Amino acid sequence: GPESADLRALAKHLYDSYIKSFPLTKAKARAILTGKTTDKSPFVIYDMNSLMMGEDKIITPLQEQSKEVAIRIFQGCQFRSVEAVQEITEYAKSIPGFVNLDLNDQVTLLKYGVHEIIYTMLASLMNKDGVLISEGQGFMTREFLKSLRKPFGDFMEPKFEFAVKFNALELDDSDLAIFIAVIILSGDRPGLLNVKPIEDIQDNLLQALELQLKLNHPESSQLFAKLLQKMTDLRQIVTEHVQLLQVIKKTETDMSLHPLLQEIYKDLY
């Protein structure tokens, strides 16, 4: 139809804006994970010894001392999130129509969307053995993460299990760009004031995603529906992590949350 060329132009705009906002693409992460690159430097962390050797090799850089390992790691993930929220915010602001939304609604969409996107993009950095860290400069094993003391040894496991199944869809960065846009423009977030303009933008993005998938994965049947079904798993990943945090805050001395994450998580589910 005559909607098709604007839907491809939209896909392309989103991809270009994705490349602008997210330093480590899936394409780059895969090159690293499969060893393809030649600037292939990843320091591998698989036990306490290698963690000590590699920790300084791993942004906002200083040294608050004496915390145990599990906590320093859990909190490293937190600071990665802080950075991710900023990249995602920039990306969101490139989606046509987004910055024209009520600013309350922009906040709400980011508040409830950032973690679903974070776990989506974390998949791009994962294989069944571990995850890339500090933009590809390190690699931390799944077994190492799982060996941490309760309750920190199981916080990653639902994310690896999601990633294994997500990565089986074989999406590329062009696909991801549109899917992430779809997640941000979610009209079911609590407390939205103006649902209709959000859903109108989302409908257009969803048309763009279906066309992208059909063209880019011409032999993958019902790829579109299977991808949209992943938004259900993502919602559960997030709500289960929120709950884990609630235990932790009621039972772990005083790990304080970064203020950006304090604001995100305050009154979230």
Partner: peptide
Amino acid sequence: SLTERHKILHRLLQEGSPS
């Protein structure tokens, strides 16, 4: 209110990320 409970996101959305 909402934006008041989200000062940082509000600034990021309107101004961008400071260096």
